Every structure is written in C-alpha cells, then in structure tokens.
Amino acid sequence: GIVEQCCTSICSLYQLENYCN
C-alpha cells in the first residue's frame, strides 16, 4: 500500500490524506 507506493514509486499528498483519522 501507501507506504510502499510513496517510497517505491511516488504519491501525492491527496493520497496520504487517505490515512488521516
């Protein structure tokens, strides 16, 4: 998921926002 995606390829801050509570 996200942690792998942001690190292995890239991610947007909008995608990260999916991890807030």
The distance of closest approach from Cβ of residue 5 to other proteins in the complex, given in angstroms and rounded to an integer, is 9
Burial code (b: 16+ CB inside 10 Å, e: under 16) for 1-21 equals: eeeeeeeeeeeeeeeeeeeee
Residues 13 and 8: their CA atoms lie apart, in Å, by 15
The distance of closest approach from Cβ of residue 18 to other proteins in the complex, given in angstroms and rounded to an integer, is 10
Residues in contact with other proteins by the rule CB under 8 A: 1-4, 6-14, 16-17, 19-21
The distance of closest approach from Cβ of residue 16 to other proteins in the complex, given in angstroms and rounded to an integer, is 5
